[PDB]
């Protein structure tokens, strides 16, 4: 059985869902004040945290990540709200072992704010994409994709909530197939 690690930069809502249905070795955050650390404390999940400011370069930053992953014998790294590009240091160690979820029907609206990009565009449907991570930005092999509709009386809050709910149901399903 694979040992799973989770990277979350913010609220860590996806981490909450994963940790409830899958045993998580530990969860990392690039923000020492992220709320995902609070959830880990409540779920009894090990949690590490260090910022980019504490390193000379991004290479040294990702070097600490690799050492941390290798120490816990991590077999799969789930990016659940990790708002940072995966550099070559981390890719060289965990190529084809890193999955990521994206609040957009790739390759439509890639980036950090795929929700706002799709909402400002006026497209009738967005989606949720779970894929592998390579050198490119959101250009990995797609594992699972679903469409998320846009309503008439939809605010940016109502629309964002529909995407996140789609993420909470899709992520455990995809991991369930990859976990074993
Ligand atoms: Cl999240
Ligand atoms: Cl997200
Ligand atoms: Cl993303």
Coordinates of C-alpha atoms and ligand atoms in Angstrom, one line a residue:
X1 CA 0.0 0.0 0.0
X2 CA 1.3 3.4 -1.0
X3 CA 2.3 6.1 1.5
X4 CA 0.6 9.4 0.6
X5 CA 1.9 12.9 1.2
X6 CA -0.1 16.1 0.7
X7 CA 1.1 19.6 -0.3
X8 CA -1.3 22.4 0.5
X9 CA -0.6 26.2 0.5
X10 CA -3.8 27.5 1.9
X11 CA -7.1 26.3 3.5
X12 CA -6.4 22.7 2.6
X13 CA -10.0 21.8 2.0
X14 CA -9.0 18.9 -0.3
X15 CA -6.6 17.6 2.3
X16 CA -9.5 17.4 4.7
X17 CA -11.3 15.0 2.3
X18 CA -8.3 12.9 1.5
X19 CA -7.2 12.4 5.1
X20 CA -10.7 11.2 6.1
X21 CA -10.7 8.3 3.5
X22 CA -7.0 7.7 3.1
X23 CA -4.1 7.3 5.6
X24 CA -1.8 10.3 5.2
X25 CA 1.8 10.0 6.2
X26 CA 2.2 13.8 6.5
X27 CA 1.1 17.1 5.1
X28 CA 3.4 20.0 4.0
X29 CA 2.7 23.7 3.7
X30 CA 4.8 26.5 2.3
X31 CA 2.9 28.9 4.6
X32 CA 3.5 28.6 8.4
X33 CA 0.1 30.3 8.9
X34 CA -2.0 28.3 6.4
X35 CA -5.2 26.8 7.8
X36 CA -4.3 23.4 6.5
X37 CA -2.0 23.1 9.5
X38 CA -5.1 23.5 11.8
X39 CA -6.9 20.7 10.0
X40 CA -3.9 18.4 10.4
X41 CA -3.8 19.1 14.1
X42 CA -7.5 18.1 14.4
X43 CA -7.2 15.0 12.3
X44 CA -4.0 13.9 14.1
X45 CA -2.0 14.1 10.9
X46 CA 1.8 14.9 10.9
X47 CA 2.5 18.3 9.5
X48 CA 5.7 20.0 8.3
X49 CA 6.0 23.7 7.3
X50 CA 8.7 26.0 6.0
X51 CA 8.7 29.0 3.6
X52 CA 10.8 30.0 0.6
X53 CA 12.1 33.0 2.5
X54 CA 14.1 30.6 4.7
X55 CA 16.2 29.4 1.8
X56 CA 19.0 30.7 -0.5
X57 CA 17.2 29.4 -3.6
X58 CA 14.3 27.3 -4.8
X59 CA 16.6 24.4 -5.3
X60 CA 17.5 24.3 -1.6
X61 CA 13.9 24.7 -0.8
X62 CA 12.9 21.7 -2.8
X63 CA 15.9 19.8 -1.6
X64 CA 14.5 19.9 1.9
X65 CA 11.2 18.6 0.5
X66 CA 12.9 15.7 -1.2
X67 CA 14.8 14.7 2.0
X68 CA 11.5 15.0 3.8
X69 CA 9.7 12.7 1.3
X70 CA 12.5 10.1 1.2
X71 CA 12.5 10.0 5.0
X72 CA 8.9 8.9 5.2
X73 CA 9.2 6.6 2.2
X74 CA 6.6 8.5 0.2
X75 CA 5.2 6.7 -2.8
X76 CA 2.7 9.3 -4.0
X77 CA 2.6 13.1 -3.6
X78 CA -0.8 14.8 -3.9
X79 CA -0.9 18.5 -4.6
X80 CA -4.0 19.7 -2.9
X81 CA -3.9 23.5 -3.3
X82 CA -0.2 23.9 -3.8
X83 CA 0.2 27.3 -5.4
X84 CA 3.9 26.9 -6.3
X85 CA 5.6 25.5 -9.5
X86 CA 7.3 22.2 -9.1
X87 CA 10.9 22.8 -9.9
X88 CA 13.4 20.4 -11.5
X89 CA 14.9 19.5 -8.1
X90 CA 11.6 17.9 -7.0
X91 CA 10.8 16.6 -10.4
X92 CA 14.1 14.7 -10.7
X93 CA 13.2 12.7 -7.5
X94 CA 9.4 12.2 -7.9
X95 CA 8.7 12.1 -11.7
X96 CA 5.5 10.2 -12.4
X97 CA 4.8 10.1 -8.7
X98 CA 3.2 13.5 -8.3
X99 CA -0.5 14.1 -9.0
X100 CA -2.3 17.5 -9.0
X101 CA -5.9 18.8 -9.0
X102 CA -6.9 21.8 -11.0
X103 CA -10.2 23.9 -10.8
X104 CA -10.5 24.0 -14.6
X105 CA -11.2 21.6 -17.4
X106 CA -7.7 21.4 -18.8
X107 CA -6.2 22.6 -21.0
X108 CA -8.9 25.3 -20.6
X109 CA -7.9 28.1 -18.2
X110 CA -4.6 26.9 -16.7
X111 CA -2.7 28.7 -14.0
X112 CA -3.1 29.9 -10.4
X113 CA -6.6 31.4 -10.8
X114 CA -8.4 29.1 -13.2
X115 CA -11.7 29.9 -11.5
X116 CA -11.6 33.7 -12.1
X117 CA -10.3 33.2 -15.6
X118 CA -13.3 31.0 -16.5
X119 CA -15.7 33.3 -14.7
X120 CA -14.5 36.4 -16.4
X121 CA -14.6 34.7 -19.8
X122 CA -18.3 33.9 -19.5
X123 CA -18.0 30.3 -20.6
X124 CA -21.1 28.1 -20.0
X125 CA -19.1 25.3 -18.5
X126 CA -15.8 24.9 -16.6
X127 CA -14.6 21.7 -14.8
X128 CA -12.2 19.9 -12.6
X129 CA -9.0 18.2 -13.8
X130 CA -6.7 15.7 -12.0
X131 CA -3.5 15.0 -13.7
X132 CA 0.2 14.0 -13.3
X133 CA 2.9 16.7 -13.0
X134 CA 5.7 17.2 -15.5
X135 CA 8.1 20.0 -16.4
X136 CA 5.3 22.2 -18.0
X137 CA 2.6 24.1 -16.2
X138 CA -0.6 22.0 -16.1
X139 CA 0.5 20.0 -19.1
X140 CA 0.7 16.6 -17.6
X141 CA -1.3 13.4 -18.5
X142 CA -4.9 13.8 -17.6
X143 CA -6.2 11.1 -15.2
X144 CA -9.8 12.2 -14.7
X145 CA -12.0 15.1 -16.0
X146 CA -15.5 16.3 -15.3
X147 CA -17.5 19.3 -16.5
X148 CA -18.9 21.9 -14.1
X149 CA -21.8 24.0 -15.3
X150 CA -22.4 27.7 -14.9
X151 CA -25.8 28.9 -13.7
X152 CA -27.7 32.1 -14.3
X153 CA -28.0 33.4 -10.7
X154 CA -24.4 32.4 -10.2
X155 CA -22.1 34.6 -8.1
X156 CA -18.4 34.1 -8.1
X157 CA -18.9 32.6 -4.6
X158 CA -21.7 30.1 -5.7
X159 CA -19.7 29.1 -8.8
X160 CA -16.4 28.6 -6.9
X161 CA -18.3 26.4 -4.4
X162 CA -19.6 24.2 -7.1
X163 CA -16.1 23.5 -8.4
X164 CA -14.7 22.8 -5.0
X165 CA -17.5 20.3 -4.2
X166 CA -16.7 18.6 -7.5
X167 CA -13.1 18.4 -6.3
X168 CA -14.1 16.8 -3.0
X169 CA -15.8 13.9 -4.8
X170 CA -13.4 13.5 -7.6
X171 CA -10.1 13.5 -5.7
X172 CA -10.8 10.5 -3.4
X173 CA -12.2 8.5 -6.4
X174 CA -9.0 9.1 -8.4
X175 CA -6.7 8.3 -5.5
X176 CA -8.7 5.2 -4.8
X177 CA -7.7 3.8 -8.1
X178 CA -4.1 4.9 -7.9
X179 CA -3.6 4.0 -4.2
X180 CA -3.5 0.3 -5.1
Ligands
LIG1 CL1 -8.0 23.1 -0.7
LIG2 CL1 -8.4 24.5 -5.8
LIG3 CL1 -3.3 24.4 -10.3

